[PDB]
Amino acid sequence: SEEQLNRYEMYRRSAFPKAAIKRLIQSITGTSVSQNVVIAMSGISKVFVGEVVEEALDVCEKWGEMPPLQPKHMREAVRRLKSKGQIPNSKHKKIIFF
Amino acid sequence: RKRLFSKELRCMMYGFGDDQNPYTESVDILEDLVIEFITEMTHKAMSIGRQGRVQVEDIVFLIRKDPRKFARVKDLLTMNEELKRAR
């Protein structure tokens, strides 16, 4: 239609800027990264945003609300993703044997 | 901290079906997920392989967790060479 073509345009053309993530990663490493790191790390974070919004619209469709996304559907989105291990936290030393 | 992903993330939520005008407190949430996702995939990437940040260990975490992040990183590494072959 005429909205699906505009939505497909924003699904492809949108990206995080490489001039800021290379500034953001290098503040964590200390020295330097490469261009093929920033190209991949800018691409995984678009999949991760698409992992949340496609699942936060499943929270909103499950409850009785409309397309505008309140934060109620966004804290619930991170809760359901973390219970399936999708959201990694490297500060919780987990233990499976008890 | 200011918001470094305020205008970029509004295009992306529209790209996955949200609205043309998302709420400010919803982009407040998604901007903090991405900064933690890049932190909790760099803090764990500087212990694997070596104490640097080569991209041969960024591709390790994407398998056995979610195959969409792996099938969309093999496309960005293949298309880097088909966009330098055209020049």
Binding site: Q70, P71 | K7, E8, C11, Y14, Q20, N21, T24, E25
Partner: peptide, 26 residues
């Protein structure tokens, strides 16, 4: 020179269509 000016035109239309009014929520 063609790659330098056309890169910012994919993002310039990404500030005219999406996000016209800024909302909030209780």
């Amino acid at each position: 020179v063609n790659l330098s000016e056309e890169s910012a035109r994919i993002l310039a239309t990404n500030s005219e269509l999406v996000g016209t009014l800024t909302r909030s929520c209780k």
